From Swiss-Prot, chains A, B:
Primary location recorded for the protein, binned into one broad class: virion
Name the UniProt record assigns to this protein: Capsid protein VP1
Shown residues within the full chain: 217 to 735 of 735
Protein source organism: Adeno-associated virus 2 (isolate Srivastava/1982) (AAV-2)
Functional description taken from the UniProt entry: Capsid protein self-assembles to form an icosahedral capsid with a T=1 symmetry, about 22 nm in diameter, and consisting of 60 copies of three size variants of the capsid protein VP1, VP2 and VP3 which differ in their N-terminus. The capsid encapsulates the genomic ssDNA. Binds to host cell heparan sulfate and uses host ITGA5-ITGB1 as coreceptor on the cell surface to provide virion attachment to target cell. This attachment induces virion internalization predominantly through clathrin-dependent endocytosis.
Record's miscellaneous remark: The ratio at which VP1, VP2 and VP3 proteins are synthesized in vivo is about 1:1:10, which is the same as in the mature virus particle.
Name of encoding gene: VP1
From Swiss-Prot, chain C:
Family per similarity comment: Belongs to the parvoviridae capsid protein family.
Domain remark text: The N-terminus of VP1 is sequestered within the mature capsid. It contains a phospholipase A2-like region and putative nuclear localization signals.
Top-level taxonomic group: Viruses
Application notes: AAV capsids serve as viral gene transfer vectors that have been shown to affect long-term gene expression and disease correction with low toxicity in animal models, and are well tolerated in human clinical trials.
Record-given protein name: Capsid protein VP1
Physiological role: Capsid protein self-assembles to form an icosahedral capsid with a T=1 symmetry, about 22 nm in diameter, and consisting of 60 copies of three size variants of the capsid protein VP1, VP2 and VP3 which differ in their N-terminus. The capsid encapsulates the genomic ssDNA. Binds to host cell heparan sulfate and uses host ITGA5-ITGB1 as coreceptor on the cell surface to provide virion attachment to target cell. This attachment induces virion internalization predominantly through clathrin-dependent endocytosis.
Other remarks on this protein: The ratio at which VP1, VP2 and VP3 proteins are synthesized in vivo is about 1:1:10, which is the same as in the mature virus particle.
Leader peptide range in chain numbering: none
Compartments it resides in: Virion; Host nucleus, Host nucleolus
Amino acid sequence: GADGVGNSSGNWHCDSTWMGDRVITTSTRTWALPTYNNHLYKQISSQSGASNDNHYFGYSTPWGYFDFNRFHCHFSPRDWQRLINNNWGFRPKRLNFKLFNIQVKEVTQNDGTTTIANNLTSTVQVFTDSEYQLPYVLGSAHQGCLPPFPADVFMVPQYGYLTLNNGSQAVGRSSFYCLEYFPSQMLRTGNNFTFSYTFEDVPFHSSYAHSQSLDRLMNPLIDQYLYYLSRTNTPSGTTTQSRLQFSQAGASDIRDQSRNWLPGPCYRQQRVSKTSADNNNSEYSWTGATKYHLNGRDSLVNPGPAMASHKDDEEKFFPQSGVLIFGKQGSEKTNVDIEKVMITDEEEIRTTNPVATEQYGSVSTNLQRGNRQAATADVNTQGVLPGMVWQDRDVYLQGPIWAKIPHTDGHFHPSPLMGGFGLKHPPPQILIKNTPVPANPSTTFSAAKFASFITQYSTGQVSVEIEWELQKENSKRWNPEIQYTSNYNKSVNVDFTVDTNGVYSEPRPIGTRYLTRNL
Amino acid sequence: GADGVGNSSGNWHCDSTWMGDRVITTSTRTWALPTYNNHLYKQISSQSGASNDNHYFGYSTPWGYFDFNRFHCHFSPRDWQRLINNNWGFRPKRLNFKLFNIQVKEVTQNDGTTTIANNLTSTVQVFTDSEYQLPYVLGSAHQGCLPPFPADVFMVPQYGYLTLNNGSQAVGRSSFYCLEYFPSQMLRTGNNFTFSYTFEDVPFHSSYAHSQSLDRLMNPLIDQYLYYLSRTNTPSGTTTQSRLQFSQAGASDIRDQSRNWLPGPCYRQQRVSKTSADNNNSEYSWTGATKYHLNGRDSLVNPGPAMASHKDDEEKFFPQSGVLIFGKQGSEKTNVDIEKVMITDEEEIRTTNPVATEQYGSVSTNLQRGNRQAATADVNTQGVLPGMVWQDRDVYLQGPIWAKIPHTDGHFHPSPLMGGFGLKHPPPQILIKNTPVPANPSTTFSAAKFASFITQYSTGQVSVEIEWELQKENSKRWNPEIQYTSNYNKSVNVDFTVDTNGVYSEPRPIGTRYLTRNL
Amino acid sequence: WELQKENSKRWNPEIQYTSNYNKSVNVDFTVDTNGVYSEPRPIGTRYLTRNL
């Protein structure tokens, strides 16, 4: 579609429709794109004496990009509530992406006055890779996503990537990608950009919590037919001789009953308390953290495998890194106090998954004999064993929607750690750039490259439409469920609403597990 | 096909054709088959006081067999270079096997003179099992494969297998297979043998190395929206009180960024250096080695799970058992010095896999509290967890092509450890035998079995044709790749070439990972 | 462009054009920290070998 200068290239669509099998969410925002790096690529690398773990080597590019990968882009807090309360599962099906009403502005800064004028003949160039030939940045939980609240205007983030490094020095295998080298549609004012995308078949996300736990999956009324060792020694009344005896497990001792399944795997965490008095006084943020080790550099495992955050009535404590932590509106980047952050809580997974701060179990250390006593050891890390079941981490409201499974010889249970849908072919990246306009070349010829350009930026609207598939809840539970409810009491401000200054805010993380299924 | 005595039963085919989707490699060799065990089965068992780990019980058979299972049989060093440099992946599709120009020779040793004469009426009998009813020997990396260089004549190896044992004594479940008990084609001079085979669908081998690592998969320019604990305590200036604080992770600290994936699993190795001065002076070849334990007998895990051999600039060090080690041409069986062996190096896997000689990471040992300091422990062995990705070991040039997945209730990620293609139904075994010819029975009848036979051997040509499927490399990388190049400098001998004596040699292992894909 | 493919029976490997494997401050044929693209060496087109 190519219109004139005065025709509008596309309408505003921000909507949600519910067909009861499907929900189709649409959102439209206004974006503003500057020129990054003065129209030129650069390499960037870890600064000077940065620690061995912090070294990196990569390139920054003039290009920007769009990321809708956060849920709250697509769902309003009320739309999120219909889904969360009424449904067992959901997955995306197909999406559509449309750019329109582009306009490019040249700015002239003279003295203190800056005049911003339309540049009608300038262009903006956009491409979507869709063959996945670029480093895929999305899914790293970077900022720059479409704003939660539709009236916001957002700046388009700059695109950059990292490659192999030794220290800050590059390695011969490190790749350099020139984004100018791909076919891209060039858009002048009165052109629009579109593409549609179809998600590959993916398991539903589970929005339900279990009403039973692995430990307690059996009829309390009836005894098992399987014996266990109830006791190992019997008294002679002067001394206790060694005689081993057996019992059928039943309501009296539940812990001894033969069970047919095992909890999910654990990689242990350190426990810290929200009350500042209970925590130790030392710097253990790093030396005490749980880490993994590649190529001689440690990396904190922030998300971790999916685990319950705390046991019964422990709500005070939370794992050191083991949870997602969101900031409240207007929170600074660094060294911000506990009251500012919003800490998510996974306790709905207690049933099938171990508590992140405690060990999987205990294991016999040695072979007993008449002269030596039996001994056991604690298993702080457990890989997958046959017959283990587990729940995936919850997606919440502002968490990421998807991630790209790396392309590798093998991978186990592709579901991402931060939550969301593992996608082998995720939604492609959309990269956008202001085409350079030179400024007043010299009359004599010079073979050097231009250092002078017209200063300009562009703006327009972006529209994303995703189609979601729903899994309805059919259950015979007699008594009421738990629902997500906005509190009835009065308040100065309404939750999920602008304040007197016009600042939209999200009071708490909303995770998707309320409705209950039996295990 | 049955020809006369004077007709040739088949032509020599040694060729390589490239259709650009497919490459079809053909190779023809000359074989010589003796008579093993004097035409009779035997049982063999561990000798006398051999150590508990070394006990075995099995049978040796008169039969020989053919194994083409090494790559260099099919590929020439130049053919291997077109594949390695130009392609991301390859797998086999279908193969064909043909035997022809068989001739049987009787030898008569009298005094010192030995005359070798054609025996025209003698036969050779050959069968391929194809129902997998025999112990499958192939894939154990035994010698006796077709020679690398087509002008070589090779002896056909003897066939034998092992079964259950207790000590050197057999167990009632141990099976005895009589190879005379299967249908087999009997080939006289002027007969040929053929069969064709179709590989079951198998994942491509990955001939590419990654241009990114799991640690560094995110945009360095943009901060995350997810907090972590930056610090745990704040000074009052007389003392440091305990106050826990948060930060958004960014270019400044990369190690703290929330990451969505984990490195592959590790089973730790001991590190040894190629420089003889750095290694400890003690016998730790065994007591220090990493092992697994079945039925009361330890076994060295030589291949190990796929792991990077060393970190950055460690090229000196290599894992104790953790690598494949090939001998240079003309290397003795036992106690051979470091200069004779060719040690392979896996460092191209550093990105997704842990270094074999160092631990997966660290894990919190205990629950901290105001009065006790937090502590951590090292995890030297890590099973698979959800969200782990890894690369399989590289196949090289002279490594094995495939292996047979054992038939069992369950198996995880069937890809073999030595490298190559796990095949549930691999190429069947081809077994070959010289039919016994008695010598001058007595005129009177005797019910005893013959101890006297004509001494003879057979020879002919064998031809193997495999069809391979290729995965082409489509990538937008701007700068040049790394290629496999024969050095330009002058030398006395050319690499991969016969010397002045006629001895073919392979100077170095050639592994298949050069071209680079982004992770 | 029209290409003439290489069909040859040479047994041993060829010579190829390879970017060196060793580490470096800058990557060859790549922008530097200032954004200046550069070509380190001339690349001539004769590598593969035909017999005369």
